[PDB]
Ligand binder design. Structure first.
Ligand SMILES: [Hg+2]
Ligand SMILES: [Hg+2]
Ligand SMILES: [Hg+2]
Lengths: 414, 416, 166
């Protein structure tokens, strides 16, 4: 007569049970823990509470969905959903206009007293705290050990609780499972990979898409593989020189490097660490009161350390190709091309014509080979230069040009 | 229908068996004599039939969450969720303290620590903290050197104290598994080598081992069981016979490194029975640990021993060492690494030699001298591009620019 | 009997479950990288107090280890051995049985028909428990050590010992 009699009775005792058609498991929610269990496991819980094992489970059928903007339950097309997002205490908190003094000292140390970049991070955090959406921008904190990177992680962890993943590393990434991404607003990585060329490149594309993809494929042990909307935002801590590969045109990473050791500061005390963590609610109240600038949430800055990572990471062949394309004689001289003169590969007249070839964008084959050999340090044939620099980067075309009287073979940049 | 949904639980308690259903594992827990197994309903029905002579269709036992928490009661409630504790002290943790160690056990630790009382005491303090407070320290101890110094004996002797709370003789084989049972509800984890004896194997495991030591939680995946997140109580003891067992950064906070080359058989006090005498004094050693006045400030203290210094400088990049030498204008580092050979090979005259050293000390290095310096330290000629991409730029030594020296404009790297 | 690298590369461990003697016929191939990949796993099988046993369609179980290992090999360097090693005795014979005064066509089967006689002999030995774990630095083990170890370690120790003769 009432296919929901057991659902009602379990609500009495503070237990909400439903059947998730999409996972073909029974959801059971108590106090912002959600577990998905088998029918025989729910019968065991039910027997202890009501003293009978019912053959039929009088519970509603819902689809479990993690959606911070939506109510506890909602309907779309007549398909009933149940929310898997449930606020933690420190998200249900009264705003204040100023942050705790000791927490501001921690962020000031992390950002080396640069108010511009600190504020952009606070705005980024505040958007996640207030709007609970994916930003598409990740923050990398790097530099010396002991600057407070982990402290900032621990303090957001108190604030975000279950909606945050702490200390995920290359080991977790190499797993076939994806729990640390399931129903998360913040994911913190402690190193993305080892600090070598091949490790950074194997993980470069997977981190690229985690930051911006609208959905993720989540696969957990003994659970059906599921597609979910992605709400993740990534904070990456690293002690390596080059934590990740970054392209020049990159839109995803802000890079902050601090070398201010906390122990070595005027204000640092033995109790300072615990005082910082006891001001989570104060910091949470501060973020709750920020007037979030939604225009700046996805803004990334080309810091000097990010610029350093870009030029370390990218191909030297691309750097040569773009120097030719931009006729950037100064780039070539900054990278030592004048050594061609000091080693007498070229006389004073030829030295002028070689520089003139670069700025004019018309490079005789003879000078192309000289330039490439001097920059890369090993002799390259015309074919190799065309196949690895000119053609793939569309620097220009190989053609016969008339230079003085003679018809000469040259690459025309254009 | 049923008047008492806990009747079977109660009857088994009278006979010394505690049975519950663990919602988080979806298995039935059974505790007898502080050993707990997690079994299926069909296996629990078989156990029950042997005891009471009937197989009940319904299991009248409570639903708990199993939690390993040494500081908490046997059962407790948090919010409305009832928990049962999975931590149970072993016999040698419930033992009356004494002020002194068994003499032969102290001869073993003195042999391991090469009679260095400071570091022995720091390790005892670390062990004593685990025994008494039962928490994760965030500091691992590496015992290395030649075979037969007693590393395994100390492991075997701590394993008689901790028993089930300790994982013995975990190797690369266990780590290459997709499962990590050796981390489930453990206070001590002992590793016999962390990886192969090469640079890339040490680096592939560096961040995995780093997080096992300090993570507040771990993802535990065991064969045929749900993947579960648990609080991490692990503390790691690493044994190794290799020259460089792990990669260690200068600023490291996690590793104490102890190297003994005192072979036990080659010692005046060593006898044939000594090995078995050491193991029969587990309780004596436990009583000693139970009475230590633990200095909690020193539990997470690491010291830069000389073997630790050797691992750090073997570990870090030669390119970073050059970059910091430039940054610090450390002419002494360059001469320590043989830069004077530049003169012995007449690559540079004595006047140029003066400007090369002064270029380093002033932090203003002309390109011609930059290349000479780098070639001499690394042994093969490097282009300016290579020097910029692998030393100057990544370590932010300085800027490559045109500088004026007397009249001439010169290309140089200006340190800053 | 006759466990080889193939069995070792299996994910299962039956040949170690409830055994007093395990016989290996070669531990790995005779190359630098094969010996080093198996060096640490054989190290711990000989001395670990417990083993993790994993069999098909059985729960992974920890058991006390009673194994003792006999390794037969036709290779020049069967295993890597450290100088300070405590685990290996190395016996090399070049006496072909067929080439001996006493060897006959029936000799092989006579040997196997005297199992009980050999078993009775071992049953009557007065075991010296002090010597059970004694290992000797034979000339072939010394040869394996100096072939196996790093040349850089040999130079480092020559400097340390000021060993001009080395
Ligand atoms: Hg996500
Ligand atoms: Hg653990
Ligand atoms: Hg065994």
């Amino acid at each position: 007569k009432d296919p929901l009699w057991l659902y009602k009775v379990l609500l009495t005792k503070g237990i909400e049970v439903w059947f998730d058609i999409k996972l073909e498991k029974y959801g059971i929610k108590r106090n912002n823990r959600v577990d998905y269990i088998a029918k025989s496991s729910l019968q065991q819980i039910v027997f202890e509470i009501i003293g009978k094992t019912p053959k039929n489970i009088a519970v509603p059928t819902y689809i479990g969905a993690y959606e911070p903007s939506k109510p506890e339950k909602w309907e779309e097309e007549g398909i009933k959903y149940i929310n898997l997002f449930k606020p933690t205490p420190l998200m249900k908190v009264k705003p204040v206009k100023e942050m705790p003094e000791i927490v501001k000292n921690l962020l000031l140390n992390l950002f080396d007293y640069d108010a511009k970049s600190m504020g952009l991070f606070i705005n980024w955090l505040a958007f996640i705290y207030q709007y609970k959406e994916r930003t598409g921008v990740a923050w990398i904190f790097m530099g010396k050990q002991g600057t407070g990177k982990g402290l900032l992680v621990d303090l957001l962890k108190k604030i975000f609780e279950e909606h945050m993943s702490s200390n995920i590393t290359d080991a977790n990434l190499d797993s076939q499972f994806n729990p640390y991404l399931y129903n998360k607003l913040i994911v913190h990585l402690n190193e993305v990979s080892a600090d070598n060329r091949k490790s950074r490149m194997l993980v470069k594309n997977r981190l690229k898409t985690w930051i911006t993809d609208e959905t993720l494929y989540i696969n957990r042990k003994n659970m059906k593989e599921v597609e979910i909307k992605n709400f993740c935002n990534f904070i990456i801590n690293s002690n390596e020189t080059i934590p990740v590969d970054i392209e020049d045109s990159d839109r995803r990473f802000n890079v902050i490097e601090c070398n201010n050791v906390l122990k070595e500061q005027e204000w640092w005390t033995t109790e300072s660490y615990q005082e910082i963590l006891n001001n989570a609610e104060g910091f949470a109240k501060y973020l709750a009161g920020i007037k979030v600038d939604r225009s700046k949430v996805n803004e990334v800055v080309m810091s000097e350390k990010k610029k350093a990572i870009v030029e370390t990471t990218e191909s030297v062949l691309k750097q040569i190709a773009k120097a030719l394309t931009d006729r950037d004689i100064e780039w070539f001289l900054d990278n030592g091309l004048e050594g061609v003169v000091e080693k007498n590969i070229v006389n004073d007249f030829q030295w002028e014509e070689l520089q003139e070839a670069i700025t004019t964008g018309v490079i005789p084959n003879k000078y192309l080979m000289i330039i490439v050999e001097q920059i890369l340090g090993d002799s390259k044939t015309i074919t190799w230069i065309k196949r690895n620099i000119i053609t793939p980067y569309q620097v220009g075309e190989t053609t016969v040009v008339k230079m003085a009287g003679k018809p000469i073979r040259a690459i025309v940049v254009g």
